[PDB]
Every structure is written in C-alpha cells, then in structure tokens.
Amino acid sequence: SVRKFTEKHEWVTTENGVGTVGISNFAQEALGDVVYCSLPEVGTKLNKQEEFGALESVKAASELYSPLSGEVTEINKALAENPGLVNKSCYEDGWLIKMTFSNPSELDELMSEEAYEKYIKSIEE
Numbered sequence: 001s002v003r004k005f006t007e008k009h010e011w012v013t014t015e016n017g018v019g020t021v022g023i024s025n026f027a028q029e030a031l032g033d034v035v036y037c038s039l040p041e042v043g044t045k046l047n048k049q050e051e052f053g054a055l056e057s058v059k060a061a062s063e064l065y066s067p068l069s070g071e072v073t074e075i076n077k078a079l080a081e082n083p084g085l086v087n088k089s090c091y092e093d094g095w096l097i098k099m100t101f102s103n104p105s106e107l108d109e110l111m112s113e114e115a116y117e118k119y120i121k122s123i124e125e
Helices: 025-031 104-109 113-124
Strands: 010-015 018-023 034-038 051-057 061-065 070-075 097-101
Antiparallel strands (some): 010 018, 034 051, 051 061, 070 097
8 A cells, every 4th residue: 555645634553454544745834843742532533624633833733534444552652752853754753643553444545645636736826
C-alpha cells in the first residue's frame, strides 16, 4: 500500500489492518505552529467521519475526523510535550493515532496521492 488522503487534509497509511493517521503538509501550514493536540483514548471506537480530536494553534482549532471505521490502538505520546512535531514531521514523527480498521472498502473512498496533488493545486491556483 501507499499513502491516501482525505478532503479535510488528513492522511492514512495502512499495514496489516492497522491505519496510521495524520495531517498533510497543506494542513499543518494552514494551522501554523501546533500548541496542543487533543487525542482520543486507546480503545475508542470510531466510525468513518466521526470526530476523534482536535489540533490547536494560535490561529485556529482544527477538528480531526476519522478516515476509517475501527478502534484506536495507539496515540502519539510525544505530542503532549512536543506538539510541534505535527508541523516539523507531519508524515512521519508527527503522526496522530493508529487504529484497526473494520471496513477495508472504506479505503477505496479516499484520495490517492495523485488526486490530492490535483486537489491542492486547484485550491492554490
């Protein structure tokens, strides 16, 4: 598999029935420096599109919506003291949550990287 995106500027990568979720570069730029990450408890059940948390910056809050249905398995504990990892490493060290996903057909609903490239090109033009 490859990274997939949502229209709310989130991403998910998948391995072995587990999705890792974060925000895109476009999203972190729009927020500016993240000062706080509100993340769900491990074991939380999520439906696709359900709110799971929020990111805070001086500029705004950004609500986080689940890309998948399933169950939270991990949160990124580094973000409590180092929330700015979201800005510095949004695709790697600044991941937000991991979850099992219960309905694999849902990935087919998300945007490919190519579609997301076209999306943000269109938005920025």
